[model samples]
Target chain A: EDVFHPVRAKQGMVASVDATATQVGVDILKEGGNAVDAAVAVGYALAVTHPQAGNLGGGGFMLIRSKNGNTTAIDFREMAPAKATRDMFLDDQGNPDSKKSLTSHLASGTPGTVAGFSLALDKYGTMPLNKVVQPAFKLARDGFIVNDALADDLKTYGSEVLPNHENSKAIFWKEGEPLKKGDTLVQANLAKSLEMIAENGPDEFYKGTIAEQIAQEMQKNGGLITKEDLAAYKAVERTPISGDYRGYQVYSMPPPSSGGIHIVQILNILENFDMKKYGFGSADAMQIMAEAEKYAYADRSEYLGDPDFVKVPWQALTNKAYAKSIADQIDINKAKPSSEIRPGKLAPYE
Target chain B: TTHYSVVDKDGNAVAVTYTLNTTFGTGIVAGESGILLNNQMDDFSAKPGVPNVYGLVGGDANAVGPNKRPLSSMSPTIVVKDGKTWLVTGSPGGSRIITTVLQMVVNSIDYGLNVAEATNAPRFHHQWLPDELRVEKGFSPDTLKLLEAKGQKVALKEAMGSTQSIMVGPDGELYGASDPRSVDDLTAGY
Candidate 1:
């Protein structure tokens, strides 16, 4: 029952999936670099150390809130290619093809990680790309030890993703055997790519050899991403959203990465009740929180999207009255299928 | 499914959670970039008015259109209490990411559970789709019956999302814990 392994760090702390990457972040902080510098350092290091999620080709959101109290969220989540369309993923029979969307190269969005990380650092970090990227380059070039979690992921899901592309098959598998735990994994090409990003900046990825090569690969593979799309990519900065719960202020990334907004809305609704009375994970607490989760999720499936493209009711949904009304809809003793729950009206705010 | 939270000595904290979408992404290392592209397009409903694998339904805002980012459940959260950073946290489970993070914060801040206790507490996730509530293997069978009695379709699974968090104690000491489900068990600082 003792699942807690609380590590106490004083000056600075970094906790990542890969211990090595987290160490890189700690190194940056100790070197007098700010949190953004450590964040980018870890971001680049993960590209080599944690291949499944840390990525140069995938994009994600970053929330940067400094001690000054201004919070900025960088939306670098992957974007659809220019050729993407509503029905493009359908098969010849017109049935929606889940495989086409899940396993194909066409499934990729124009990656925004480099641009996004660079943006955060440029605005807030004291170090340059050259400095922050050093650890990642070293990890990729010098090779590193694989961890248990990654070994399992490869054994389980690597087969499905690898073998599809010649390069991926070569890197992740050795004649169909995935790399095991404690094995030495090296990415020579990734190291070189990191060097180019360091020397020439992230522009090397969007406008330089990296982009050209990805365009060529897409063209050859029947994919849609092009050099133009890469060049057009930009990581946007948006204000972070927050919700007050139990005297604490929760701040997170906004839409395009809707996790932040939904978390706030759900918390807003859950705040209406006495969480302490229900207790954590007690069936009573679980039922009500689950109800709130369903409501937020129902709205998520319906109204949430890239804010630049859609009118999200950022204020109304978080309003106490709206949240109270949302809670009113929940039948504590009964669970409602999501279909039966309609999104709360937010037209005036949207 | 990888996430990390970093906070320097100055109370500057950053919790970043990024994924290749599905494991290994599309499995295609892009050209010479040696990068795995995210299969995030699958996160969006291929067609409007449909649910994706996580049971997240999306409208035009999350459709596969030119330059549109897909909807995601990757939650990186930060909580500030009393002019100091209280928690820096995030997770890697596809849909369960939200509930797992939410539970840990509630457990620690609201219920006074220690980091491990909060992270390891029995948890459940209801994604509003498939009409089922998923409970990881800690809940008693009676709990399942209660959920079912409340009309939830119960799904018992062996595991859920892994949550990594750093809690700033009242005295300013940093108490960090990785999810016991798959604990990294490492927090490095000066």
Candidate 2:
């Protein structure tokens, strides 16, 4: 049914943007794999089915909570290449070049997806990488049914950029034509890459044949990533940031992802008031949340970043006292224009 | 970007989020490898104190540098209750990612909505630089008017984030939902 409803089960549950990917995760769980194993399987499966963002070329964060209450954050985000410079995306006139930043070879960062997935499997998973990724490998080699979402993306955004590269065109464009819904989209090259990764593990992507191919592609196109950059890539396991809201404890990704910091910071501000009183969807409730978001986001623009390169005032920002001050400034009946707000004055950073 | 959440029978949960920055990413498949590289460098502030494509500003802290990971708003989150994994959730919406996840948690915990209701509820966002409350349709007109009366600039925008989330009920039953904002396969359990 298209109508939204909850899917209930007693043993386990898997949710993903693509049904095939979600089923892959469920299959892994049924085979006795833990949540982390299912997650890795789902991640690889999305790369084959949902190429829009599920990627071997991109990277992201994973938050894991064990059955025993222990939590960890995996920071597998993409990093700038060794040759990257501060003004790499600026044009001759000292302005940001949209084309270069958005579509050029120079747009790429050293990818961390393979390494990240492998790390999560190594530390927290119960199954082997080869076993967990088999579903995705088969999908890529055999092919999957193109759904309306993938077809729409190919027609819309894909039309803008897929024609530019031969390798891209070969997989996404058939007879120099965009793929339509229901097409059997098989990616032999991606299948080969996935198979190699499964056999040789993360090294296959970062240091072996795939790395050479990526490096060659960059060299032929003036991109920044090189064999060295790919080899240097590592997925770090950082401490998970935790905050308390009401009686529940929230755990999320830490530094290098401002998402964790700001979500907690905003929640802290909102905690100062009894939100249940305002109720859901009420003007006062929504406005209160929006007001708190302005202050938190103002602080985010000024302070949050990669912790390795900068001193993020994480402690001060997530402090309850800090949140209370911001909450006190909120005008419940009226919205405070963002123009009147600035990043909060935290000590030392200020 | 895409996200997936899994909670196994043992109550262990993992929320994973990964991305190529935008749809199809740099749009270049890497040679014969068939991997599309991420245009994540644009996620860094190309200039001092400038906002990138999503209109989310970055400071010197996020300025491009050799081997420096750019700041991102991808938040893979887990919620625990009574010392057990209660919820596993995350989303894929550049700057809107954080708030999207935020509202999901709020909707479930504070407002007492189930996973499906929480996911389908209309969403809103405000990145500091945009200086406007960007919202999806479905919020009450009176709510919008009230927000405006408070001096906040309100703007209507398309849906943001496809949140794939799962919640473990008090009885240890699993409840899951794929965001209705986009086409999704299924939210299944066994």
Candidate 3:
């Protein structure tokens, strides 16, 4: 009775969690920008419109593929500060300190987003940083009407986290309450920061005034990042890991982010079976996929890490033969408890 | 976490998935810079065999260390068919990000679903630890019963990731679907 439909177009498309950010990317495409250009612009815009997750202070992965078929991955994941220790999140009693790790100053990581967007825009984008980021600057400076989704998020989480921080509270709270829907939310300070990044380029964020402010903020708190750490941050362009699923080629982020290798590993295992026969959402299909997920994740907890620091056994993990072996262990009619599955042993890589 | 996908007329595609560890990150905005820093340091295994915020257990490979990048579940992916970009998709669900992306890929390729159908489909996740099969609400009671009969511990949970996806149709049209799970998500095309 109910119907769901996708937006269709003959030329280009931008799908994002925020309507404003999606429009930003669409305008970039309409203005003759390429996929990377639109993506970079959208990334900047989201930091202004959707701050809960979209951020200049956070990090992420970008998978880009040219129309000609060349593909690459940008790993802008946040890094531990130089002063980080292996047991820094542990309490004096040696137990994991959940509260300190989640809500404290020391929880912050060295930001990499500024570097990440810059690298993408330089290598594959058609637009310059200043031009691409102008839309976000306008949104931050002039403000946008807060939508219900963002308003709800503010009411739900803003109070619990923002009340103590003067800067955060000033921007997110209005008249002692979180900004609600229909409220015009503006971020003047963020706009100033963006203006500097746009005017002076990414260096302004990592090595210039913005960097000093971040370092000072950390130093004022009990945080670990410093001017040296902020200046040292860089986004790396890595070769994306690839695998075949049926006839389609899948490209995803590589090590330092565990998502790619395990996704390929699980897909390889599923390739051996006729998933179509199981039917979508049918128990038979979900059972097999869930079983494959268990093995892949079991391996994730053990072997996945930063490739620069550890040698992930990605070669074997994504191998078709290795997946076939894993496929053999899955019972078609029965589910295996995850506790029964240990990390797969890779003889040579281990 | 949040995700966005872009596909131009030329068949080029980009999928980006980024995050602050949790809502508002550490709740500490950097001085006048107005940057809300991420609590991503918590992603590193504090002690071996310990679970993070998402109940994901990490080993020594993901242990905290100076200058080390914490392992993450951000899967920004591009799928190709016959040497042309087919789908640009990604999600933001912390530990469930991998499975959410995986299901979208599988739903498109194996189940023959269009981008919208795939985007709206119910999702289930199993992350190896915790050992419980977490499922969304749309699964039929019969399906859940069958899954449980197969010795699976099924827990009906809230929705999973907000995935933004775009597929290049065979006719060279672009089909975009913003996940229905989030009210603010949208897909624009022209």
Candidate 4:
């Protein structure tokens, strides 16, 4: 049997899927950097090396726990353009025209990742930008093998997404066919862009030449992103959403991502039951969890969204008394459908 | 001693489950760092009855759509019990995420194991699809045999998901544990 071995270390170590990025961060730590410094170094390395997941053109969320005990969440997830309208994707009946509205450059929001990384580094790191961005620059210049996953992504979506763009096709495909596993994949232009950022800082990417390129690409391709939108992007800091189980406290991503509240809601509902007595992996345990997942997911589908735009009932969902009341409705012996889970007033959190 | 920290601010703490998804998600190697991007999007249910490489399934709620982030089993969780601060933890297992988290919380609340002992202890998982119960190698052979006798399919994997956990002890000390199954899992600074 092939065994999965997880990587574990004790002295404030960094572990990433890519050994190179991991090593880059580790090197930073060795050079007297803290976790935040290491994270920034790795973040840049991923942008160059793991382009699919690490995006200079996309955005994501980050949760930071400072050494002195201040914990904050950075919301860099892409934001809709100021011109974006709620009914932009809706038809006469309010149905989402997903195909036309979801995958195009028009679908992309203003990217905040570069600015997010900049905020993280400036606020927490000790190293200079030039010192930390070397690994990514080297990777972008030297190139790397097209792994099975990248090959698969290309094989799956390349025809529709990449074939239209000449530069994209030139790098992602060979003679009109997507590159296969183990093939060398290079991105010299992207390397040049990264160099510009490293030299001039995130400003180059957010408000300078790179920003112009992105806006031009979107406009030429009928996308929604604009130069002004690019220049106006900013990452916001928010209080972390947290819950308790036994004696430990758990925190996770809040609205914009319903994961935090949803996970907490499910755990709280399940806490009313004695899972250990049923033993791990018991049928009863599975049934209860699945049901709880369904319940929370139901609420998620109806209420969860960008808090800045949508009103989320954060307090009602996390309130212990509320959780207990929901748990009391559980049948224990059967799974309840979404229709069965009742909605309550539970005043929305301000 | 492993290190773990939780900020209990007005009853909210962000429990995070950060990982490569797998040792290498999708085993896709990228560039010079040997980095693998998370196929987290693949966690989206591809189609009914068709399991991806990870032996996981998805449904309508998790259907593939642009910018529709996949449903994750990475259950970074927070549990509050008896009007007191309890536990903050999560695990990284494709579908087994919820299972590992449930066990740790249960062991601490019902069985009375310390956070370190509960998290370090061997675990088990059973995602509905694949129809098999995977147990850590440390599970008792008798228990395995009994489970098998009940028509339960069983396979012994390394350990279950790597769980990182922290609990506030009765004495007001914070106890933490990183799963024994992972080589790089850790907690530092008390």
Best by TM-score: 3
- Report the candidate with higher DockQ, 2 versus 3: 3
**Per-model DockQ:** 0.71, 0.80, 0.85, 0.09
Docking class of 4: incorrect
Pick out the ten consecutive residues of candidate 3 chain B with the lowest summed lDDT: B19-28
Q: Of the candidates numbered 2 and 4, which has the greater TM-score value?
A: 2
How badly does each model clash, as a count of residue pairs? Answer: 2, 2, 0, 34
lDDT, candidate 4, B7-125, per-residue tens: 22122223333433322222222222222223233343445434544565433444444333334444445455544444666655655665666677667766667766776667765
Stronger candidate by DockQ (1 vs 2):
2
lDDT of each: 0.82, 0.90, 0.91, 0.57
Q: How is the predicted docking of candidate 3 categorized under the CAPRI scheme?
A: high
User: For model 3, what is the error of residue A53's alpha carbon versus the real structure, in angstroms, after optimal superposition?
Assistant: 1.1
Q: Can you rank all candidates by DockQ, best first?
A: 3, 2, 1, 4
Location of the lowest summed lDDT over 10 successive residues in candidate 4 chain A: A1-10
Candidate 4 regions exceeding 4 Å error are A1-6, A91-94, A157-160, A347-350, B1-190
Query: Residue by residue across A268-309, what tens digits does model 2's lDDT show?
Result: 999998888888888888888888999888888888888999
Pairs that collide, model 1: A11-B9, A301-B57
What lDDT score is found at residue A234 in candidate 1?
93
By DockQ, the better pick of 2 and 4 is 2
i-RMS for every candidate (Å) is 1.7, 1.5, 1.1, 9.0
